Amino acid sequence: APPIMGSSVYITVELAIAVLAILGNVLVCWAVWLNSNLQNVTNYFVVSLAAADILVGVLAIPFAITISTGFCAACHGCLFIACFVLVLAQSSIFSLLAIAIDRYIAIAIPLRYNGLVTGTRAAGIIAICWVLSFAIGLTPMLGWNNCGQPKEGKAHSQGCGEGQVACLFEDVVPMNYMVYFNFFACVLVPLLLMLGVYLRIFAAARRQLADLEDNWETLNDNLKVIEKADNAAQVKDALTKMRAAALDAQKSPEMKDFRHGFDILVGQIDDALKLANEGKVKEAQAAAEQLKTTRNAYIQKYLERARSTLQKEVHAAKSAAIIAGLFALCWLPLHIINCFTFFCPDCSHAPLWLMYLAIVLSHTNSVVNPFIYAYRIREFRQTFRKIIRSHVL
């Protein structure tokens, strides 16, 4: 069948993908620019991500279309249009790796997060990572290429000029770079680091929610113990434990009542302890019952406001992990095909239709991030609606 027929489907699909990558990711950047609530360090790596996805539809996809033709070109010039998408894919990994780290710092040390993780530093890291993306993505241009052994039978068959080659990806980029350097070192290892960072985010979250439920139990159980105690020493024991678990939880209009609610609580425990150390066992049990009023007015509201925040931090970590995981679902096929081309020379090269299919799959990854934000993030969804209603409609 004529090559232009199959090539037309691939090109139409690529262009259709390009439009969707530019539209959806320009919509993300427009939301982060307008909504002040969306302006945080975590969302500055999202804009770096969206920028990389914008450049895929504007440059990487046009470049991919160009190299599918095998047009005659200067080898190093063809080497650039073959390696530019590696820069964009490398930038996406750095951002994906920074979001995972930023979400870990947020849940592992929320108190020193505002000073440690600032916007000006996020900008310096984004700039640093973008430069390194060009260094890593264009390494073949520094010498690790196949321009020293061009297929001159292929170049002559296509009427190429002196110093030109038939611009094909696997003919100018060595496969040991794509497998050992790009896939294993620069794509796989970083994705494994993310997997481990997300394992520690969720581990730190399950632990903290449980430890807050342990204090909530240690208080009420010690209150029940006092309501059934018999002497002043028992009461003094159940209060010594409660004071430890109270100050332990202490560690805005809401933070003012949160600090007042614990002053009352810890103070009321001091009230009962003095009586327990004075031999008054009845007056101590009565003073401890006033904690039941502080509990149903301050403590139970704090426990639930802290439980909700930990849940909101887990929801966001999951949303971030769905973005890095879908990056693997889209890029692993094309990487796994390169491994078969590289590791098994006795295997038939994957057919051209599977290459196209794997190539367009890697490009659909630049369309899906705006959908995860709109689906899994309430603030992004609302801001997308505002832009669509006010400007696009």
Ligand X SMILES: CCCCCCCC/C=C\CCCCCCCC(=O)OC[C@H](O)CO
Ligand Y SMILES: CCCCC#Cc1nc(N)c2nc(-c3cccs3)n([C@@H]3OC[C@@H](O)[C@H]3O)c2n1
Chain position whose Cβ is nearest to ligand Y: 64
Q: Which stretch binds ligand X (CB under 6 A): 8-16, 149-157, 206-214, 304-312?
A: 8-16
Evaluated on CA atoms 104, 110, 111, 114, the torsion sign reads positive
User: Of ligand Y, ligand X, ligand OLA, none, which one sits near residue 19, judging by CB under 5 to 8 A according to partner kind?
Assistant: none
Coil, helix or strand at residue 74: strand
C-beta separation of 183 from 339 below 8 A:
yes
What does 24 interact with, of ligand X, ligand OLA, ligand CLR, none (CB < 5 to 8 A by kind)? ligand OLA
**Per CB under 6 A, 336 contacts ligand CLR:** yes
Nearer to ligand Y, 88 or 321 (CB): 88
- Paired tokens of 390: 């006010």
Q: What secondary structure letter does DSSP report for 150? A: -
98 and 20 Cβ atoms separated by less than 8 Å: no
Assigned token pair, 232: 């002043």
- Nearest distance from C-beta of residue 80 to ligand Y, angstroms: 11
Among 37, 109, 114, 123, the residue binding ligand OLA under the rule CB under 6 A is 123
Q: Which residue is listed with tokens 């969206």? A: 50
| Binds 89: which of ligand X, ligand CLR, ligand Y, none (CB < 5-8 Å by kind) | ligand Y
Task: CB nearer to ligand CLR: give 34 or 329.
Answer: 329
Between CA 68 and CA 352 the distance in angstroms is 10
338 binds ligand Y (CB under 6 A): yes
User: Closest separation between CB of residue 334 and ligand Y, Å?
Assistant: 4
x-or-dash string of contact with ligand CLR, 174-213, rule CB under 6 A? --------------x-------------------------
CA distance 169 to 185: 20
Quick check: 170 binds ligand Y (CB under 6 A)?
yes
CA–CA distance, 346 with 180 (Å, rounded to integer): 19
Lookup: tokens for 392: 């696009």
B/e letters for 285-302, b = 16+ CB within 10 Å, e = fewer, are: bebbeebeebbeebbeeb
Q: Are 238 and 226 in contact (CB under 8 A)?
A: yes
Q: Which residues bind ligand CLR (CB under 6 A)?
A: 73-74, 77-78, 80-81, 188, 329, 332-333, 336-337, 339-340, 343-344, 347-348, 350, 354
Q: Which residues bind ligand X (CB under 6 A)?
A: 6, 9-10, 13, 29, 32-33, 39, 44, 47, 51, 54-55, 352-353, 356-357, 360-361, 364
